[PDB]
Motif scaffolding. Structure first.
Motif, short mmCIF file in Angstrom:
data_model
loop_
_atom_site.label_atom_id
_atom_site.label_comp_id
_atom_site.label_asym_id
_atom_site.label_seq_id
_atom_site.Cartn_x
_atom_site.Cartn_y
_atom_site.Cartn_z
N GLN A 152 -8.57 17.83 -28.62
CA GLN A 152 -7.34 17.63 -29.37
C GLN A 152 -6.60 16.37 -28.89
N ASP A 153 -6.90 15.90 -27.67
CA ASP A 153 -6.28 14.73 -27.08
C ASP A 153 -7.20 13.50 -27.19
N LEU A 154 -8.09 13.46 -28.18
CA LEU A 154 -9.18 12.49 -28.13
C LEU A 154 -9.09 11.58 -29.34
N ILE A 155 -9.07 10.26 -29.11
CA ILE A 155 -9.11 9.34 -30.23
C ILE A 155 -10.57 9.20 -30.63
N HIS A 156 -10.86 9.42 -31.91
CA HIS A 156 -12.24 9.47 -32.36
C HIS A 156 -12.44 8.85 -33.75
N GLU A 157 -13.62 8.26 -33.95
CA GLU A 157 -14.04 7.84 -35.27
C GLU A 157 -15.45 8.36 -35.50
N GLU A 158 -15.63 9.15 -36.58
CA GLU A 158 -16.95 9.63 -36.94
C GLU A 158 -17.86 8.42 -37.12
N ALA A 159 -19.08 8.52 -36.57
CA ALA A 159 -20.14 7.54 -36.73
C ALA A 159 -21.43 8.20 -36.29
N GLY A 160 -22.54 7.93 -36.99
CA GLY A 160 -23.80 8.54 -36.62
C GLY A 160 -23.75 10.05 -36.84
N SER A 161 -23.15 10.46 -37.96
CA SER A 161 -23.17 11.84 -38.39
C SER A 161 -24.63 12.28 -38.56
N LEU A 162 -24.90 13.55 -38.30
CA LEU A 162 -26.21 14.16 -38.45
C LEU A 162 -26.23 15.03 -39.70
N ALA A 163 -27.44 15.42 -40.15
CA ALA A 163 -27.62 16.22 -41.35
C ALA A 163 -27.91 17.69 -41.02
N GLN A 164 -27.99 18.00 -39.72
CA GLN A 164 -28.32 19.32 -39.23
C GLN A 164 -27.65 19.48 -37.87
N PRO A 165 -27.53 20.71 -37.33
CA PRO A 165 -27.00 20.94 -36.00
C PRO A 165 -27.72 20.15 -34.92
N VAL A 166 -26.97 19.86 -33.86
CA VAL A 166 -27.47 19.20 -32.67
C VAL A 166 -28.51 20.09 -32.00
N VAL A 168 -27.75 4.23 -32.90
CA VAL A 168 -27.54 2.87 -33.34
C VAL A 168 -26.28 2.79 -34.19
N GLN A 169 -26.06 3.79 -35.04
CA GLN A 169 -24.93 3.77 -35.95
C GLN A 169 -23.63 3.80 -35.18
N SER A 170 -23.63 4.57 -34.10
CA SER A 170 -22.45 4.77 -33.29
C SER A 170 -22.15 3.51 -32.49
N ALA A 171 -23.19 2.90 -31.93
CA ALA A 171 -23.01 1.69 -31.14
C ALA A 171 -22.60 0.55 -32.06
N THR A 172 -23.11 0.59 -33.30
CA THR A 172 -22.83 -0.42 -34.30
C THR A 172 -21.36 -0.30 -34.71
N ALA A 173 -20.87 0.93 -34.82
CA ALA A 173 -19.48 1.18 -35.16
C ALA A 173 -18.53 0.71 -34.05
N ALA A 174 -18.93 0.91 -32.79
CA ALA A 174 -18.13 0.50 -31.66
C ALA A 174 -18.05 -1.02 -31.54
N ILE A 175 -19.20 -1.68 -31.74
CA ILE A 175 -19.25 -3.13 -31.68
C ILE A 175 -18.34 -3.73 -32.74
N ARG A 176 -18.31 -3.13 -33.93
CA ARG A 176 -17.58 -3.70 -35.06
C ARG A 176 -16.08 -3.56 -34.82
N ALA A 177 -15.70 -2.52 -34.08
CA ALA A 177 -14.31 -2.33 -33.72
C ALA A 177 -13.89 -3.41 -32.73
N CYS A 178 -14.86 -3.92 -31.95
CA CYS A 178 -14.60 -4.99 -31.01
C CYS A 178 -14.54 -6.33 -31.73
N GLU A 179 -15.46 -6.56 -32.68
CA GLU A 179 -15.50 -7.78 -33.48
C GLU A 179 -14.21 -7.95 -34.28
N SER A 180 -13.66 -6.86 -34.81
CA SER A 180 -12.45 -6.92 -35.60
C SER A 180 -11.23 -7.01 -34.68
#
Ligand SMILES: [Mg+2]
Ligand SMILES: [Mg+2]
Ligand SMILES: [Zn+2]
Ligand SMILES: [Zn+2]
Lengths: 314, 314
Positions: A61-75, A89-101
């Motif tokens: 509940q105290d966590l800043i989060h952005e969905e990235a690299g969603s799965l289609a089935q349970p972990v 890759v999707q998650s790392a790609t999302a993090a990098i883009r937050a840095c680029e912007s």
């Protein structure tokens, strides 16, 4: 006490490995103010799974989060699956883009599994390449800086043959690596560093006795760098200057020149920083540990050490 | 505390520098038995001068000595003179020849002054070349092994540009360096050493991904060396293999690959061994110190450390 002094992105890596769990364990140890500076990139479903396991649902509940690299089935903890490699890759790609912007100032990537990524049909030769890819850059405009046992060493060339490295070495390439690394040094908490540049040839060519390369390449680049008001010594023989240990940044011409010192002096606790544009991306120094995923065995020391390094105070 | 277990030649170097002095100071520290195993090559006139200065005339009568590099005029401490440069070479040449004939088992050379030698009209690019010259060998059969902090590293190439080194690197050249260094290992007291060979390229080319050189050069050379019954690992990335610290001899392809680890781990305690035929010649790790010559304040620790290394037991 307080180790996070700037906005960071944390990609949780392989959602089936220990990445999620060590992300939670690290954040838990931070203050509330510190956690608010760390934005997390990854499937919420995996952070949920790790939190239930570690009994840290209080923390989500105290966590800043952005969905990235969603799965289609349970972990599925411990399992190598193509979908977990894509997530990675999707998650790392999302993090990098937050840095680029400019939403964050640097990126940390929790452990990936190379096989997972490969079985998804995705090319991956390490973080330097991925960052080049996502940012739209040639691989040789991203530099690797190793940090370990007091040494910071940026490499002008990296993963290619010695001949090929020599053929690409120019005054401008040296300059780029230095400016990239100096900007990175500000982040690491050394605003005005003392820089030493390695010679291409033994004894930095000893004038021109052992080749012309240093006359053509490192000597002009050092003068251009001084005129812009940088404190720069060299070129000097890599052996001699390294031994004196009075510099906050060494500039290596060839892979081995920098990789030998670092691995000799710091076999267990080194960081690899991929630098490109404004983006500084560091891994943790270890694998995804599939066998203990979900089993409550992996501690967050290495990640916390990476956070501390990238989150240093000006 | 016996450090000399075999016959050695000690050339006293530049007779105007600290060589004679440090020779006397080192012999003084040995037992009588040990001194009798060290034959001294140089002008008697300079040992006389040094003995009066250091107050060690007591020591001269118990000294094995052969006149070499006689002077035509009195010694002038501190002065750079062509005659002192000739003396230097003559005396080292006399000591080497005693090793070639088998009177002694290795050679130590006290400090030379490069200018003095040059002013006498003598070509000199270091001990490797001198030894090649005196022995009647091509200069590329004579190799430099650095020894420091447990590491022994022979270099296939040395004082030339990286390009020039890469252009002469062959399977046969690697082989020669190894056999020269292995023989030298026997002297140092490791009769059957475990050898690691460095890659020319990063990660030893990682197959052929980072260049063809290793597949053409280091890989065939390691196989040839195994078939002759040598215990040899590699080629491996110099960083990776050096880090394991489980070999008695590393083989470097390039100057810096060997010089970086040695000067990092042993900025004082490094000895440089020139190897050719059966002759092993080591410098003391410092210059002739013309500024203090005659003042009686030169430390013989580096020479004593060299004697200990070349006079090892097994
Ligand atoms: Mg050098
Ligand atoms: Mg190859
Ligand atoms: Zn590498
Ligand atoms: Zn050298």
């Amino acid at each position: 006490m307080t180790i996070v002094h700037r906005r960071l992105a944390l990609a949780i890596g392989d959602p089936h490995g220990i990445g999620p769990e060590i992300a939670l364990k690290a954040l838990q140890q931070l203050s509330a103010t510190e956690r608010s500076l760390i934005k997390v990139y990854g499937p919420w479903s995996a952070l949920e799974q790790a939190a239930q396991i570690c009994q840290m649902e209080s923390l989500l509940q105290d966590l800043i989060h952005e969905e990235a690299g969603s799965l289609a089935q349970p972990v599925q903890c411990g399992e190598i699956t193509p979908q977990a490699g894509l997530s990675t890759v999707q998650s790392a790609t999302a993090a990098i883009r937050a840095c680029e912007s400019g939403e964050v100032d640097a990126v940390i990537a929790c452990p990936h599994h190379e096989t997972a990524i490969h079985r998804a049909g995705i090319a991956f030769s390490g973080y330097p390449s991925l960052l080049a890819n996502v940012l739209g850059m040639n691989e040789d405009e991203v530099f690797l800086m190793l940090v370990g046992a007091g040494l910071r060493i940026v490499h002008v060339t990296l993963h290619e043959s010695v001949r090929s490295a020599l053929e690409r070495l120019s005054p401008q390439l040296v300059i780029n690596a230095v400016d990239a690394a100096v900007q990175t040094c500000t982040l690491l908490g050394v605003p005005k560093p003392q820089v030493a540049v390695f010679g291409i040839n033994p004894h930095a060519s000893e004038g021109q006795l052992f080749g012309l390369e240093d006359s053509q390449i490192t000597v002009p680049a050092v003068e251009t760098l001084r005129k812009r008001g940088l404190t720069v010594d060299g070129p000097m023989g890599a052996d001699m200057v390294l031994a004196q240990r009075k510099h906050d940044l060494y500039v290596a011409m060839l892979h081995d020149q920098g990789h030998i010192p670092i691995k000799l002096l710091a076999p267990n606790g080194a960081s690899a920083l991929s630098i490109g544009g404004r983006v500084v991306l560091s891994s943790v120094g270890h694998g995804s540990a599939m066998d203990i995923a979900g089993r409550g065995v992996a501690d967050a020391t290495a990640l916390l050490r990476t956070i501390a390094l990238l989150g240093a105070q000006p």
